[PDB]
Design a protein around this ligand. Sequence first.
Ligand SMILES: [K+]
Ligand SMILES: [K+]
Ligand SMILES: [K+]
Ligand SMILES: [K+]
Ligand SMILES: [K+]
Ligand SMILES: [Mg+2]
Ligand SMILES: [Mg+2]
Ligand SMILES: [Mg+2]
Ligand SMILES: [Mg+2]
Ligand SMILES: [Mg+2]
Ligand SMILES: [Mg+2]
Ligand SMILES: [Mg+2]
Lengths: 213, 293, 159, 170
Amino acid sequence: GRRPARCYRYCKNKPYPKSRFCRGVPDAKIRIFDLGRKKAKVDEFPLGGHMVSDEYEQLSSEALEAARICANKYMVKSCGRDGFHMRVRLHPFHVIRINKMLSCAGADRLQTGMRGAFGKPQGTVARVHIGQVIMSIRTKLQNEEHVIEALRRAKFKFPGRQKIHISKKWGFTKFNADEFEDMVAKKCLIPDGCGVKYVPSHGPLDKWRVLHS
Amino acid sequence: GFVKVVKNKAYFKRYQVKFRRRREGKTDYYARKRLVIQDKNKYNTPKYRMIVRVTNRDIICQIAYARIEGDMIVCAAYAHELPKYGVKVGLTNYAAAYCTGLLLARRLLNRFGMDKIYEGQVEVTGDEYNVESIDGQPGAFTCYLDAGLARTTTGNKVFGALKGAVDGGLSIPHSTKRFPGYDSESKEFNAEVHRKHIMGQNVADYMRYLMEEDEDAYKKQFSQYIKNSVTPDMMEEMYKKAHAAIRENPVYEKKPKKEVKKKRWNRPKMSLAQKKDRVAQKKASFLRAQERA
Amino acid sequence: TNTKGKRRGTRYMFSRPFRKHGVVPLATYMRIYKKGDIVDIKGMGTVQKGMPHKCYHGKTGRVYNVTQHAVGIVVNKQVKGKILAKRINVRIEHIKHSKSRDSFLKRVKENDQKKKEAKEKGTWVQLKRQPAPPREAHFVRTNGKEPELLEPIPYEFMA
Amino acid sequence: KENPMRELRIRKLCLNICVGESGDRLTRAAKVLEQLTGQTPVFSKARYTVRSFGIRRNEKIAVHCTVRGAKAEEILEKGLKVREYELRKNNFSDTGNFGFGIQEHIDLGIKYDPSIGIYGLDFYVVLGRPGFSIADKKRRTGCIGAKHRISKEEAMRWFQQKYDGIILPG
RNA sequence: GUCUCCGUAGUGUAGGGUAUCACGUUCGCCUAAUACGCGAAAGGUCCUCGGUUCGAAACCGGGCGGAAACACCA
RNA sequence: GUCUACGGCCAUACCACCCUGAACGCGCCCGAUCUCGUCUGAUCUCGGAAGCUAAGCAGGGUCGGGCCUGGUUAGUACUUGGAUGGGAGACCGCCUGGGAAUACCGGGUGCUGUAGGCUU
RNA sequence: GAGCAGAAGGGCAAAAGCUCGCUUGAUCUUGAUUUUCAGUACGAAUACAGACCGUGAAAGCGGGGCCUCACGAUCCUUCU
RNA sequence: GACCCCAGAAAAGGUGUUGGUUGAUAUAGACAGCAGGACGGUGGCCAUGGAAGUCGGAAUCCGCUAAGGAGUGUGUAACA
RNA sequence: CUCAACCUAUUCUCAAACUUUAAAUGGGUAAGAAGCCCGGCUCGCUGGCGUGGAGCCGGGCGUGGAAUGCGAGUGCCUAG
RNA sequence: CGGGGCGGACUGUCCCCAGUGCGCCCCGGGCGGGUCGCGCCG
Ligand SMILES: [K+]
Ligand SMILES: [K+]
Ligand SMILES: [K+]
Ligand SMILES: [K+]
Ligand SMILES: [K+]
Ligand SMILES: [Mg+2]
Ligand SMILES: [Mg+2]
Ligand SMILES: [Mg+2]
Ligand SMILES: [Mg+2]
Ligand SMILES: [Mg+2]
Ligand SMILES: [Mg+2]
Ligand SMILES: [Mg+2]
């Protein structure tokens, strides 16, 4: 009973989040945003590939769910189930509305036409900008061709134009890959979970001496 | 750690400190606004107020008016200059509060040149007195009492300072409800036990009271009264002579003192280079201690 | 369709600035407002008495009447195609002296004194302020350094 | 070695008795505090209505008194004598102040009266150093400062030294 | 689609200060036995969530179900 | 060089912990006859001057948090006006002017008015 | 991060919140002004001025409710 | 195919052609063609009814080596 | 030993009815002779004061106190 | 890019171990702006 995605492709309205004013919103189709070995440390998956949108548009929660599954199946096939970690980086926080008309042979039955036309919550979409990252995959450095192909397949589930980009950052961190190792060597970066903690050279020295001890 | 830290980073980022003198617990800005602010249609006419502050060991009486750059004090009187005439012991009491309030009144009137007019109530009686301006003469000085944070119950020493000033010649609006002679149940001002408080007879009775029950307790309480022999029977005459001496010479002279060196007693603020050197040394010492193992 | 409430749409305008709530500073009460001086109408929200209406916030007028707590201000309001001088009573919390008139009075005092000094010593000096003139000719020295050659950088994709 | 202004001492003893409901029980409990303290007790109303406890809001539920000075010290020794000068370490608090409870008021001092009940009572002594009053003061009030604060360990020494008390591991 | 009403012992129902009645269930009597009859006992988030209140089955906002009344003129 | 009383601006002043404090001062402190308030002289009010700077307070310290102010972010984001510019559109580029904010990296950590003291 | 009667927003800490004490400025009057606006009215509101008071030691504050809503012409009737 | 508004088109494709980016191989002879080799443990283990390299689950090694994957596909019930 | 809750330092993504910070465009006022500076007089308002404020009366100051452009002010009647 | 002599203050190298700043004077090198500045060249 869902409308074609072309009806809600463009960011035509102001953001309409689920809040105390917008009640009765059905849950989004996508509930999981990280897959693969999420517990892998930062050094395990140095290579990171992104899907980047070229279009300012809206992506439905169903499309994000479809592309997440499509990329997951191929990575599991090509890199094993523990050889990657995917992060969907768009959350469907914008609610789209439908002004539902009775699909019967009669406007006499209180179709009401365009009177009181403000619609009811019908779904949730994610608003994406040009240059924004839709999906991210981190894995080992020999799986680059599998990351590109997996992201290429997931592009077919999306309305507009998307670009595949191999980032120069190390994994999911915000630090460059070529400066990553020596920054850990000089303890500017400390690993935790799947990310790193930047340690600035300020604050109490007591935290400086727990490092170097 | 099992409970959210209330004073986290976000708590200090949104924290709005109060006014400095509000944080110090010295100024009630709710009362100050109603005391210092002049009507806009009176323009730069000063609004005077009698500041009375009773300290553990001193009484401070000041007359000031507000200006944007800060309060301007036109005359001040202290209870520590009371020993210049008569009363040298038993300061910061009700009798000394009357004396310093009277001294402030006489000193201010002397500076303005209005001593002969507005003598005030020379003969000390506790009854209500209010000075009236004399026609053809400059008007009586009008000011208002600034009690501060003191609890203004009946018998407060700030009203003793007010009584001394109004008897000195200053026109301060007031009532007798807060004088020691006021009776709560009968709603009657005795005006005679108030005069006894002004003359320190309550203290004088206490000295002769303690003499008859416990001698050493009397010596503990009135130890400095024993020095120079201030006895209960001479207290009223001591205060009368003090009042008369205040009337005769209220002018204040200051002790000169310039034969002082620049001795600095506070540690100066450390420079940026010293702070970094200290961090560098502490870093080096920690590493060096590690190589000892 | 919009309501006609006196404070509709004043959610942010009459709100206090960040970390500046609480007691009103008392220098704002000690300011002296004569007749004929120029004041800006702010309209702080801590004091609800004598508040200006929302159409006078950010407007500047001339004081014509002084009372115990407020002033009478003649301030221009534009209603459709007519500008008419409204007279409003505003408590001194919501107004402050306009520095546009203060700076010009300083300039007049400089101008009148500068004219006096010029007559006393003799020669002529410029009083009017001129618009920023075109730049005069000048020499720019290389100092034995060749100016650095700039080049547009190649494009590569940020993130 | 220690400054005399750092000596620990009893600020107040804060006796409290809580009964279920307002009535003759509360009034007789008030007399129990009055005889022990020689001091008029004050009743405390219930903040909220709780059906489980059968209390209604603004209803007098408990009677309490605060005792200071030598009177407090004499009441404390009677109560400690009931507990045989044995306090559990959990009873001492992080703020530096401890409390104990007595099941029967009759045993210490007061003879049982047929009119008077069998009520027990609650002790909570507050320990302080000189200068703790600066927080209570109206003018120029201030916090006491870290070194001047009393720790749970310091209170435990004070009991162990003043009353030859025993702090059982409980 | 619009508007209105109702959710309370197992059943059918009454009713802002500790929940009623009948039937039903359990136990004991009478009877050779069952039924009837007699003497006792037990049974109820008052549909759900939030709010007002000292206190909500109650009062108000919602959400789940059920029952109604409308949808005409070409 | 400091303090007290009253302040102005109201964190460069706040918060946490540590160190130091000579002299006046401010305090802590002692007491409850009187004044006045308490369930309690704890607070408030009053009368004092044995003791103490432990605390308040002042100064200093912390690769301190915060705050203030710079750099970067960045001529980036956004934007006035223009085109018979591009593109199916979504949007984007250019011309003409204006031009931010995080993260990240530095510096600073109360100034001052009136009156009155101490400091050889 | 509570509360301030209620919708929401603003405002507020020795406050504007809570508890006590005393009270009736929720009183008698004339004008001016703001809001809607035609710059008409009503309603509501602001600053004054003249009385008579309340409270507080006093400065002051108060002519209803912290502010933004809570209301009604001619004719007729009724009361003072 | 052919000119603002404007009067019709998208995703997705092309070994048509043109330009560009990045990477790789090559006289120690690339690329494409034609012509030889493409083995032993080992019909490797666990799945079995046959699964021998090719229906599947894991491992991915050794020697001859110039080179052979304990296997890319066709095929066989399995072989071949 | 593990999974929860909780706390701490991080991390992804958001707001028409959120916000520390915060543009561009925009709104008000000022850019003098009704101004400035000297004296003096009046007041029942204000008042420690020859105070404060306002008004009034004389006198002297023109380099006419940004650019650009333009002749302005004012009344009655009035259609659509 | 720094040299000499006196007061504080810091470091877990404390045998006169090591290091930092400030207050006065004596020097050393470089840079910018005014200078009747003074000469030479265009
Ligand atoms: K609207
Ligand atoms: K509306
Ligand atoms: K009106
Ligand atoms: K009055
Ligand atoms: K009538
Ligand atoms: Mg269809
Ligand atoms: Mg829309
Ligand atoms: Mg007060
Ligand atoms: Mg009001
Ligand atoms: Mg810092
Ligand atoms: Mg531009
Ligand atoms: Mg009046």
